[PDB]
Structures are given as C-alpha cells and as structure tokens.
Amino acid sequence: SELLVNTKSGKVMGTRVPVLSSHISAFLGIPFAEPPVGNMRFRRPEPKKPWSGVWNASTYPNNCQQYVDEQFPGFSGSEMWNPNREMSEDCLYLNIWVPSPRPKSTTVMVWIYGGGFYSGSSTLDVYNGKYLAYTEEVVLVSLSYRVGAFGFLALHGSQEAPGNVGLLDQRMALQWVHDNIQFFGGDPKTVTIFGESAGGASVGMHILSPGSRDLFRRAILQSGSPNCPWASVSVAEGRRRAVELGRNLNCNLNSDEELIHCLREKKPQELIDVEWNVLPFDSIFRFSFVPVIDGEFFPTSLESMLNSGNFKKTQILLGVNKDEGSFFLLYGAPGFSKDSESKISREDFMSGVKLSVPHANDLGLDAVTLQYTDWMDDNNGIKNRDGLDDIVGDHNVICPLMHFVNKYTKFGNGTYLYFFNHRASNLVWPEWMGVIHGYEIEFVFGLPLVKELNYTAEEEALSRRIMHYWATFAKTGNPNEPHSQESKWPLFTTKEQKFIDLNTEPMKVHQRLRVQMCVFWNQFLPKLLNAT
Amino acid sequence: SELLVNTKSGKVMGTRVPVLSSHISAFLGIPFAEPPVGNMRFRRPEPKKPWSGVWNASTYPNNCQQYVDEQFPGFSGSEMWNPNREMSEDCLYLNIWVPSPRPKSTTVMVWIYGGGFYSGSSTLDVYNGKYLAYTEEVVLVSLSYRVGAFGFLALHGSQEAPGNVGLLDQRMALQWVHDNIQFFGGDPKTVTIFGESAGGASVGMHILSPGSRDLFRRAILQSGSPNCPWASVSVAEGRRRAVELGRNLNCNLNSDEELIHCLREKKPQELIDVEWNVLPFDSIFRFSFVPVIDGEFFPTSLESMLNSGNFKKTQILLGVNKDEGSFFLLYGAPGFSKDSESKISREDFMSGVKLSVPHANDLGLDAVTLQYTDWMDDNNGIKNRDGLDDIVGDHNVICPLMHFVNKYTKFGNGTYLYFFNHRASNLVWPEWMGVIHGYEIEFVFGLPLVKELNYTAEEEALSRRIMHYWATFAKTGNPNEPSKWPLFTTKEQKFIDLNTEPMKVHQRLRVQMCVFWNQFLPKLLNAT
C-alpha cells in the first residue's frame, strides 16, 4: 500500500487527502523524538524509540506549549497564527505530504515555522503542505520544535538545561528525514530546509552549526536570518534570564540544579505566564528564550563564523517583505491601531523609536531619529508612521539579512535575493500595515490556488511562479528553469548585488537592497554604540 | 567747501568722483588710530592724535600686512581679493562716500571686509562704495583692521599682545564714525554695520561684545556669523599658536614679553611666511590668527551668551550663498581644478571630508560621510563633488549661521534671512563652483550698474533691489518699503531666495543638514 511505510523506527499509516480535484498522501503526527517531558523538560531531545505495530499518522499532532495571542479574539488575521491543536509538551512530531503515485527519489523541502522562537505550530492552515507537494511534485515535510523556555532555557555549563534544545529538536527531525525520507520517495541527498521569521533564522543557524550541516543540501530563508538582533543572546544573558525566570516563580536559586528542578515542577502555563518578565527592556520584536552563542551548537560568534567563512557552502534563496515592521508596532506601540490609519504624532514617534531600539543609548536614539525624520515636514503623521515602520523592519529583518547575504556570498555557491512587495487583495489587516511580516507565506504554500479563498487570477499566477521558483531552486539550486522563455531571476553577487521584486507586475531587477539604511544599521550605528 | 570737513581730531579734505554720469564726495584714507607699528605691534589700537592743517583724503590708504594669494597669478577672480595698494602696518584708515549735495543726518552703513581674519582690504574694486552711496543716498563707510598675527596674536594675560586687537581696531573705527559721522551728513544714531565672511562674523561679535553694542543701531551679516567654527579659538589654543609662531621664528620662549619682543623684531613678511604653520590640523577653511574668547571682549562662551540673550537686541538681516564651499575645495582639496568639471572619485571624497572636518574623530567622519553619500551611486563624480561642496559650506557657513539666526531671534527685535543663489552671467570661475563665497558682494555694492562690466539687464535690477533692501533695512530696520520679504520667526522660519526670478518664500533653510551639524554631530563628538 501507498499509505503504509516501513520507517527505520517502525511502521506508519498515512491518509489520502483531496487536493485541487485530485489526491496525495499525507503522514501526519509522526514522532521523531521521545516526548521531552517530566525530568526531560529543558533537556536535549532523545531519539524516538522504535515501536511495534502501525503508527496512526492520519491526523495533526499537538502544538508545543506556547504563549497564545489574545490581542484580537476571533480575528482571523491573528488567530491564523495561534495553535490550532491541543498544546502539550509532547509535541515533537513531523508531517509529510507525498505525491500520489509516490515519487521515486524526489526533492524534499522541510518547513521550519517561525514565531520569535516563543511560538509557532506545524499544523496551521497556512502551512498545509498539500498544494506545494502536489503542484511541484516534491515531498514536503513540516517539523516542530520546543519554543519559549521549553526549547531555549539556557543555563550554560549545565547538561540539564544547556540551551538550544529547540534547535536540537529541529536537527533531530532533520536527521529523521535523512534516515527515513527515502522510504517516502524522497532523496536524502536533496533536502532543502526553509523557514520564515525565527524559521529563517533557524535555517541560517543550521547553515552555521557544524552538527547540522550535513543534514541538508540547500536552504531558503524568508524574513529572517541567524544574526538578527532578536534571534540570539550570550551565555550570560541566557543565564540571567533563566535565573530571573526562577526569581519570578519564587524558585530556589542556590544552584542550577535546584533552579532547574523547581522549574520542572511548574505547570507549562505557569512558565508561560512570566515568560515576558525576563526581558531587559520594554520593547517590540524581542523574545525571552532564544538560541545562545554557547560555543557548541555555535562554535564562535555568528559574526566571526560569518567573517571566516566557517559555514556550510551551498546555494541559498532568501528575501524580505516590504513592511516587516507593522505587525509589531500594532501590538506594542502607542498610536497604532488596527481600526484606523494610525497616523503618528511626533511624540509617539519618539517613544516608538525607543521601544524599537531598546539596546541603544541616547546618542543612538538620536542617530536613528535623525536618520528617519523629514525635518522639513516632521509633524506629518503618515511620514512618522511609515518612518517607524521602516525603522522596525530595517533594524530587525532587512538589514540583518543583507549583512548575512553579503557575507554568505563571498563564500557560497549561489545566492538569489527577493523583495516581496505584493499586498494581497483579500488581506484582513488594515491598509497602513502594507505587505506584512509573514504574508508571503500563503503564496509560497499556494493558498491562492484554492478558489474559495478569493484571490485574484494574477494572485494565483504569482503563487504559481513563487512555488515554481522555490521548488525549482530546491531541485537544482537555481530558481530558474534552463532555456526558458520567461524573465530570469539573476544571481546575487557581491559586486552587482542584484535582486528581484516578487509581485504581480512583470519581474524587475534592482540592485543594492536598502543600502542606505543598512549602511546605517550594519556599519555606523554598531560603531557609534561601541564607541559609547 | 562740501569737500572740506572739520572732524573732532582735525580737518579733512575729500575729493569729487564721478559715478553713473553724476558725482558724489569721497573721503579716502582718513586715519582713525595711531599707526600700530614698532612698539605698538600686537597692541590695542590707540586713538589717532589730532592734527593741525588739512588731511589729504583724496586717495586710498595702504592695505594691512597680509598673505597675498598667488594660486592664480594674473587671474582676476582671485586677484580681485588681493591688496591693490602697498601693504604696511600703518593701515588703520577708513573711507567715507557722501552723496552730493551733502545730506543731513542720513543713514550710515559701515562695511567690514572679510578674508578669514588673515586678509582683506578696504580698497578692493568690489568695495567701491560710490554706487551704493549715490544710488541709495547713504553715507557709506569702509573701515579696516589688522589681520593675521598683527590683529590676533593672542597671549592672554599680557598687555603687549592681549588678543582681539583687530576687533578692537574695528571698534575704534566705529567710535570714530560715532563721534564724527555727523560732520559728513550722517546720523550716528542710525549706523548699520555690515560685512561678509570674517566680516559677517565680526558684525556678530560686535552684537555680542558689550563694549561694541552702543556704537551701531542694526546689523547685516553676509555668509558669516560669530559662532563659525573658523572664526574663534580659546585662550589656550590662542596661546598655543602664539608660542608655536615663536618656535617657528626661533624666538626666546621663556616668557610672554620676551616672545613678544622677538616677534616685534621680525619684518612683516617673516611672520606672514610662517603663519599657517601653527594650525593644529591639515585643513581647509581654517585660519591661524583669529578672535579669542578672552572673557573681556567676549564675556563668556559665544553659546552661553546666545542662550542667555546676552547681546544687543535690534533688527538683523543676513543670509548665505548657495555654494559657499567651492572656493575652499578648489584651493586645498585634491580632485578639484579651476580648469575642469572637477568630478570627484570616492577616494578624493574621503580625503576631502577629512580636510573639511579636521577636529572630528573617525566616528565623526563616518557620520559626515554617511550623511552626504548616496550609496546607490557612490562613484558618481558629480554627486561626490556637489556633496563635498555642501559639507564645507554647511559646516563652515550655513549651519553656524542658522544656529545663530535661531538663537538670536528668541530675543531679537526682527530677523530677515536670505539665500543668494544667482550665478553672475559674467563669472570668471568655472560652472562647477556655482554661487561662490563672496559673490553676492558685487551685487550688494551695485557693480552690476556700471555697464562696461557686462552684467545682464536683469542683474542690474537684482542689484538694484538688493541695495534697496539693504539700505531700506539700514534706514528702517525692515528691508520692505511700504512682493514682501517676510520676517523670520522661530515658528515659521521663513526666508527668501535672492535671484533674478520673482521672489519666492521658503521655510526652514537647510534644516536637515543643519540639524546634523548643529545638534547631532556636536553631541556625537562630545560623547566620543
């Protein structure tokens, strides 16, 4: 049977699912690690021990314990990102979509959801992997990993809560894929890991980490890169936060042993409820428990590894969306509302840049402000809104990614950069938010191909070319089909620095994506701040 | 006679001079102070001792000892600024242009030449005051003052070379006008001091200095203000340079009096020959001997005086020209040439910014560069040129003056700001240089009216209105006679363009770049 598979660990029974007037195979909730529960909470994940009999893999598994967004209850625009299954610590599972009839040894794509390393689920409606698998005939894998404290509590020196275990869960799902994807018609030698936001950062951390390097061939990073300011902390910062987490729950703080034993006695939701209390400053686009530069999963600073070319050499495809910042300003900055134009006064702009660049001293904030203010028209609420938007998106996403692409390229074997700037005709968020962080995803997953979701014809077409670029990149390492008559996404090179827009207009090639502002964020500000 | 005048210090005989198919009286080289020579070198000026008989004021006096420019021998665009008379240390004279028939108690305008405090003359063809006096019926005065070491050698604490004597010379010329201009038909209660560059700066120093306030009514500042980076130094920096001059002429440096007596024994040119060697940085738009914040001519810091409103409260009219920096890049920056578009490479740009902002550290230089560079097209030679042309102009002239204008307006009684962006049709300098530092002057003095100088008909008209604004301001404190030039206010910050096209009103003159230069960069440099 097409739906029964003999994996290394045990047998698996999938389910046939309809997809655009056809069908394909799905294997949902397949375990790839022993449940990280009880005294195992905060520990490195252990391989799932073999099982006898058939594993029912016909339904999505649990989502990991995480903070649920309740800003807009019942609003589809936000809840579309919330867990849609029972949360549980027993959440280490992956999902596979296999074309029917089963392919021989085809391209694999592994999806690593984002969500600031504090949230995310593999089961969301926007991650339904059937359309992409079916349309591009690839084997699509959806993995999961512990988020928040559960996946990132870092008490360096301790083997009970070493940190980076959520990144280690990802690696184990990858190893799983490497050991078994062949039984599903996938080529373990041609696996592309791709992810958005903390998912794009994860992908890049696997490109850097020596222990993850050989578990994949190529990589795709969307709206996130490993060196993002919010994607990692030092061992000290990691330890301070874990200690503060304990102080927040009246834990014994004599030793890591006692602190850790204490935390393992708290119910999940108890940790979640104080999770945000450990951050250094009041801010936006900052998350509590994230990867740590431990000298193990990450041998040295991300920067030195990047400067010395100490990373996996291969082809990467990555890009950003036009308004990566709006989502965050809406949730945590004064002046912004989802029920208005959110025109920002000069006062709100000032408090806004402070909430956005939390680590900056006075001189630093002055420089940012100077950088994003039109002093001829400084009371213009629209300019102030768009100004703060760009601040948040340039600082947290775009410039850190450009820094990364520019470094990676000196050593890599092929880079393709994109700027997604298409505002969906059916977006549920207000107009001022633009092409929001996370909204190219529905195009990558081909949701526009399901007529009942009301996308325009041209949107279906955009979705089809994006999936084709992705899959084609995945199979070959170049998004372009050889000897094709269509316009060509050119190679990004350190000398030319070319990239394309991704929208419904005919492709356009541009150069030096946001250089001005990125020269500021990547070179100048860092210096100004170092000078102190 | 109309040409014979009894002054307080003595009798003076002027001379009749033609002007636009007509005539007016001219009184040239009237002495307003004892020649500051010999033992008097570097000292405060002493009032001119009265004389018996009649003083021959029919020809221009000597120009003060100064570094003559030889960058372009023969070339008129540069030589028009060099001394056109013999240089001497006996150079403290002033010139008066009086309309004929002699007016009664009329408006006076006193001109103060510039040239970074190291040069300048009262006799240049472009300062001939006959056109302005005749056309507007004002008594026009051009005074002079010691420049370079002779006017600003500063060994604070000594009476042999206290510093600021050149500013004290200007002040004495003002006292003279105050005590005598009435005898020439001028109203001492309606004296306007105006000047450009070091001259525009001087004007502001007299607005600041308590000792100079009651000697004039109003002020006009052209492309210069007191707080310009190049217009002053501290008592220590002043002393450091004075000592370094001695070290350069192998002088005994045991004490101030000894160092001084030694500098007095040198021939004028010997001092001039080592003048630039005392600058601490390798740069442009920087001059060796300049005013010193001594606590006497200037009570406190220029800024504290500005913040506390400690200065003369009156009306002021000032402005800048579009391309202040070009003159300076041409002379001292690589890449620039009088005979080419002077397109600048990225490398000549980096060095050019280091030459323009000599005090800033690396972080500072980065902020400057970041600010004036278009990174999507960083190898554009024209943007690099125009870009460097703005740095030097914004830093040295435009932003220091906008800072001044905004501090002054908080306490003042009326501000009028202009932006001069017309390029003379007959300019001898290359197009890339634009509207150069000092070229509004020919318009303020109405040279466009003398037909043989070949200015367009519309340039004569631009000159005519500029002169009328100046004189009308001088006379009433408002350049408008009952299209208006609106008042500048801290809320609106309005100013006008001064060109051939119909007047246009703008707001917030170069606010973007000046927020950088006046607020951000200073802070950056202090912190780091």
Ligand SMILES: C[As+](C)(C)CCO[C@@H](c1ccccc1[N+](=O)O)C(F)(F)F
């Ligand atoms: C494809 As998503 C990385 C789950 C887009 C939204 O997620 C952001 C976010 C940003 C600003 C406000 C709220 C949220 N949110 O609720 O998820 C965050 F934080 F997860 F990264």
Ligand SMILES: C[As+](C)(C)CCO[C@@H](c1ccccc1[N+](=O)O)C(F)(F)F
């Ligand atoms: C006690 As809280 C007001 C959930 C700490 C941070 O809150 C952020 C936030 C809240 C929810 C998802 C993402 C973010 N963020 O990325 O900053 C914001 F925006 F509300 F301040």
Ligand SMILES: C[As+](C)(C)CCO[C@@H](c1ccccc1[N+](=O)O)C(F)(F)F
């Ligand atoms: C009305 As003027 C203030 C005597 C014209 C420019 O003079 C500048 C200058 C700037 C750059 C190069 C050369 C010179 N120059 O020979 O005078 C300086 F220095 F006098 F102010």
Ligand SMILES: C[As+](C)(C)CCO[C@@H](c1ccccc1[N+](=O)O)C(F)(F)F
């Ligand atoms: C030994 As030299 C080459 C007379 C030091 C300064 O020289 C300036 C300069 C020379 C003549 C008039 C004005 C300036 N200036 O304002 O900087 C420049 F430009 F030549 F370097």
Ligand SMILES: [Cl-]
């Ligand atoms: Cl003495």
